[PDB]
Write a protein that binds this ligand. Structure first.
Ligand code: HEM
Ligand code: HEM
Ligand code: HEM
Ligand code: HEM
Lengths: 140, 146, 146, 140
């Protein structure tokens, strides 16, 4: 589970993301599409071209949800319930894909936060994304 | 692997900029910190109790350099990883008893380290080329398990 | 795949005893039941609301037989699953948008169905050979994804 | 998240295992070692040969813990705390392996409980093994 230190690490790192969350969300998606092409099977309805407005739009949504999990770090299961239901019942994304997005979110942060992306922070963010993934897949 | 000519150039160009000693120590240390279960193989290394303990451990740094050194050699034989890594594959299985999943974990940590170090230069497509590379190495290292 | 003549014989001989009709319908139905999210591609099939409803659905049964059929034909090209499934791989990617992870789930369901069916006959060594086959098939089907 | 039906299904199926649980424990390991040879990396001190007393004994051990878990289907986290500890802090098995043992256990049950291994029971057992795996890797 997330320890007090993990929580501080996540609020601190995400804190720095600030207003770039949206842009970082878009970039993590693009990285995922390029490195793990099989993930594209979930977005047949999207223009996945470089700088697609759909991706940009989608990136913001994902980043807003993560921002929302950080804001409710002590009540994630409830803060994300709706999203959990959506993914379990309508999107039906195979569980393994969550780990791929997580990984690409970690890469994006690393690439953008050189000073804050320390080993300890890296570890905390990894556990954080695993927890968010667990919640989103809880109702499957 | 399946590296387009242009993916092979991108892989090679960046790798030229890497300080293998340093990246080696960083990647290995980070692995033992992010996935602490991986510490099972290094109890003779000493204190791995905290992140500073790991990151600064002279034995972790030396080992990482060894591992990344073997990896850099792999990058010059991208055509024959399986051949390149065969004796190492045999050793990890038969002598070390290292679960091959550790090789994929290391692969992912390495990609985060390259992202960390190169910033914007580690573009989405440069990452896609490295992803193929780390997978190939992990696969080559697991090829002789039985 | 990388099947030993002995492992090849074991697959081949058990298969000759398989009623593709029944096995195909049960493998596909079990999949929809055990991993409910796989139902996302079969909304047009009808009522999948219950195990009873899935197991009974004729559209499910007939799709199962079509799947096992193609699978069945692939065991005849065990030296080239890749070339045997190239067109089917493109189709699942380009037309059906099926995540290849599904190919793995089915494989494993398939193995449970064979065990279910052959009890005694489905020995550890025979399962090992089948596991290599379902993995090879999933890999060949995923091969043309881009 | 095991539903009441699931707990019922699991209690029933396991109920039939009865005196054979140890033997099934052993056979599942044997299938795992053969099917997923990478799992052997965790047992270098064992004789992995067919009918090895070490595997047999360990099979019993595994079976008993599964039995204890069916019995405490409602309080798993608690009935398996010590085992959670041992795996997280001592054994340190990579989490991917839990899915390989679970699969082999299903196969084993299938092969020996034809009548009882219905689609609905199969679904229930899968979720149970997943639940058990989660608990066992919860303190990593
Ligand atoms: C932990 C990571 C994830 C988060 C925070 C997340 C969050 C979201 C959010 C906020 C939405 C929009 C819902 C709305 O319209 O209000 C969404 C939709 C969606 N997500 Fe997830 N998601 C995650 C993982 C994934 C993964 C890994 C995939 C597949 C690779 C995926 C596939 C989808 C799809 C296909 C949609 C619908 C898009 C559309 O048609 O607009 N999600 N997700
Ligand atoms: C990119 C993947 C890797 C490469 C190329 C690699 C390479 C090497 C090399 C060259 C050695 C020394 C061989 C010798 O002693 O003769 C070694 C030893 C070792 N490696 Fe690997 N390695 C890799 C990944 C890993 C991982 C991920 C782990 C564990 C998590 C690991 C565990 C070990 C251990 C425990 C030793 C022996 C240490 C000692 O001297 O006591 N290796 N590796
Ligand atoms: C053993 C692996 C599989 C094989 C050999 C296989 C083969 C086939 C074949 C031969 C078709 C006929 C369609 C045509 O030719 O136009 C088909 C269609 C299809 N398959 Fe696959 N399949 C496999 C796995 C899967 C899985 C696991 C899923 C989803 C869970 C899936 C989803 C579909 C769908 C949605 C269609 C279209 C059926 C329709 O048109 O109603 N397949 N497959
Ligand atoms: C179904 C989930 C599992 C359960 C219920 C389970 C249960 C157990 C039990 C009861 C023990 C013996 C504790 C004692 O000696 O007091 C044990 C030990 C052990 N387990 Fe786990 N186990 C599971 C999964 C795994 C997996 C997947 C692996 C590795 C691939 C594994 C590797 C080990 C090892 C190496 C030991 C020590 C064996 C020895 O040295 O005697 N376990 N486990």
């Amino acid at each position: 589970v997330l320890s007090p230190a993990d929580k501080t690490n996540v609020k601190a790192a995400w804190g720095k993301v600030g207003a770039h969350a949206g842009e970082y969300g878009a970039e993590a998606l693009e990285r995922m599409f390029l490195s793990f092409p099989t993930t594209k099977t979930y977005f047949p309805h999207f223009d996945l071209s470089h700088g697609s407005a759909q991706v940009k739009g989608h990136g913001k949504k994902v980043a807003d949800a993560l921002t929302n999990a950080v804001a409710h770090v002590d009540d994630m299961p409830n803060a994300l319930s709706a999203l959990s239901d959506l993914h379990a019942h309508k999107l039906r994304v195979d569980p393994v894909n969550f780990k791929l997005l997580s990984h690409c979110l970690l890469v994006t942060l690393a690439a953008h936060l050189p000073a804050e992306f320390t080993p300890a922070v890296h570890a905390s963010l990894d556990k954080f994304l695993a927890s968010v993934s667990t919640v989103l897949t809880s109702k499957y | 692997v399946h590296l387009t000519p242009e993916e092979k150039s991108a892989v090679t160009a960046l790798w030229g900029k890497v300080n293998v000693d340093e990246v080696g120590g960083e990647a290995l240390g980070r692995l033992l910190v992010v996935y602490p279960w991986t510490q099972r193989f290094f109890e003779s290394f000493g204190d791995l109790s905290t992140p500073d303990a790991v990151m600064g451990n002279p034995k972790v740094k030396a080992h990482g350099k060894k591992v990344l050194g073997a990896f850099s050699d792999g990058l010059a034989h991208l055509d024959n990883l399986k051949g390149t890594f065969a004796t190492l594959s045999e050793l990890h299985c038969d002598k070390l008893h290292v679960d091959p999943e550790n090789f994929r974990l290391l692969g992912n940590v390495l990609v985060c380290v390259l992202a960390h170090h190169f910033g914007k230069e580690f573009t989405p497509p440069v990452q896609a080329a490295y992803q193929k590379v780390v997978a190939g190495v992990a696969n080559a290292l697991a090829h002789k398990y039985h």
